[PDB]
């Protein structure tokens, strides 16, 4: 795919027929399944098994095999009860699984991020050793292109922190590590966190020294004390016209802070210059 020339090396990578590839993959799946049910007595073989699993997930592009490995890892993390595969060693495989972000196929990445979201919404595992080692995965989730996933991650993030402006600024400045997102403009996430400490319910309006269009009340003020009667009678059509106009006027003055603030925090994620301005 990269077009690199083939060199003369006895162990040089080669290509295999599709039929042989499928046969090999089926054999590998059977071998892994049979080996993984005796995890309590592997002993000296405990580490090579996890090493080969990590290599497979890191390099292979076979969707069924990666899906099976991920399902096994999730089963270890959640439904396991006995002595674990070397306690917090499955975290090594989970960390190796972060490579899905640059694959041009978001299926495996989406499965992994769903698993991470599950891990970080479970009350049993809160402030535990597991949630301290998945910071990189959580940040990668907050950086996701998929809008729904990113919004879910940011919603959890905002739900955890406090709701005071000084506290949120302090957390941004010295409360978080941004080493994981060092190659991207990560101040958009910081701005999104900051905007969570703003009241979004109250109505808004421009100041009194700003410029707007001509109000009708100013135009009808001269007739304040004119107690006259129009020569032409008021008809139903005029009444409906004025009722609709009054409804529109009422709808005019119903702008809240969210109607402006939310679109900006959504739009800052596709343009860096506006993020800088914000």
């Amino acid at each position: 795919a990269s077009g690199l020339r083939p060199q003369a090396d006895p162990n040089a990578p080669t290509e295999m027929k599709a039929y042989d590839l499928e046969i090999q993959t089926n054999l590998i799946l059977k071998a892994i399944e049979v080996t993984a049910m005796r995890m309590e007595i592997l002993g000296d073989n405990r580490r090579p098994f996890l090493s080969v699993l990590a290599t497979i997930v890191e390099k292979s592009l076979h969707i069924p095999l990666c899906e099976k490995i991920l399902e096994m890892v999730e089963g270890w993390v959640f439904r396991s009860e006995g002595t674990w595969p070397t306690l917090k060693e499955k975290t090594a495989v989970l960390h190796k699984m972060i490579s899905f972000e640059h694959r041009t196929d978001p299926t495996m990445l989406h499965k992994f991020l769903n698993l991470v979201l599950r891990i970080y919404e479970d009350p049993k595992i809160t402030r535990t050793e597991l949630t301290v080692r998945m910071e990189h995965a959580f940040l990668i989730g907050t950086r996701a292109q998929d809008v729904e996933m990113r919004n879910k991650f940011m919603s959890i993030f905002d739900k955890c922190l406090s709701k005071t402006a000084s506290a949120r600024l302090a957390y941004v400045i010295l409360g978080q590590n941004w080493d994981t997102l060092a190659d991207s403009y990560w101040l958009a996430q910081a701005s999104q966190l900051l905007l969570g400490a703003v009241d979004m319910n109250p109505t808004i309006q421009l100041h009194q020294d700003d410029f707007r269009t001509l109000p009708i009340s100013q135009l009808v003020a001269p007739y304040a004390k004119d107690s006259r009667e129009p020569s032409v009678m008021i008809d139903d059509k005029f009444e409906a016209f004025m009722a609709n106009h009054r409804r529109f006027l009422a709808e005019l003055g119903d702008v809240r802070a969210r109607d402006v603030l939310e679109p900006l925090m959504q739009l800052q994620h596709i343009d860096a210059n506006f993020a800088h301005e914000l």
């Binding site: 100041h207 001269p222 020569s231 008021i234 006027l249 679109p263 900006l264 739009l267 301005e277």
Partner: protein, 336 residues
Amino acid sequence: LFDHLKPHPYSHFHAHTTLRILGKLGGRNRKFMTEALPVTFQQYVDDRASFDLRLIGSKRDRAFPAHLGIDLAIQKLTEIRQYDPYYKRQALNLIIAQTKLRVGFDSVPEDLPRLVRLQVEDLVKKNRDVDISLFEVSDKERSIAKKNEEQALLKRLLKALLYAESIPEFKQEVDALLVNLARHFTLIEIGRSVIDMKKAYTPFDTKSGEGPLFIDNRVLSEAILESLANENLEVREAAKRLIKEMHNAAVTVFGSPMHVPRMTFWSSLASTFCHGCYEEEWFTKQGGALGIQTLLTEIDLGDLWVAAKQIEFVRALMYVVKDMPQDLPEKTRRTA
């Protein structure tokens, strides 16, 4: 040329070619300057427009700029992954909110219809017993340049709203909003006509100044002019429908179509469409010709009005014929 000089991850072919060209130029590559250097500046020094916000751990309100994401929103809306509709929806939301903020909120009396009909009665006749003292107070504390900037921004917002009709998902909401705005502006225009009629009948030289400063609601005319000669069809149809809606609202408010052409609005519309015919862009010329055609064959203001405007119309159309380059398509000249 200086924009191709970027390090490795950037294409090195372009950068090395540019470096070679500059090296071959030699001493001439730093001697071409004739003027000093361009610099960007603001037209006014007053504070910009803003609204008030509220931080949770505080007791006071703070001002927030009201111009922040308008440029990006318009660019993302009127210039066209599976996530595009999401961002387009966000942009439309922001634009609608900004337009609503710029129009403003008002509280009118209970018996508005009576006052409106009294205004119509005074306009049809030439009553001279109307007090316009509030419209002679001088406003010598604010900036006129800032007002011009706000007017231009509102015109841009209206143009974006009008363009947003070429998307089947957004059509209904923007259409309803535009119709409501047109009716509101007709109501404004009737009162403005009354005030203008009263003003010209008191030729004085007293030391009373002009009126207050406000955003002119006639930006819609310019937006309509710029929308008539659009590539998409729905945009043109909506632009025509807005003119028809304004005329219908005026007819409904007056009671009969007899005295509708006594407003000052229609002369302004005619002047806008006539000046459109003299610009140096062919689509502005086409819009002007189409606007004159719409005023002629779809509203029917009367016969005295046309007899008054015929000379200007003929001059403008003949100029459009005169000034079109002879190697572009012939559609504009045929329209004229």
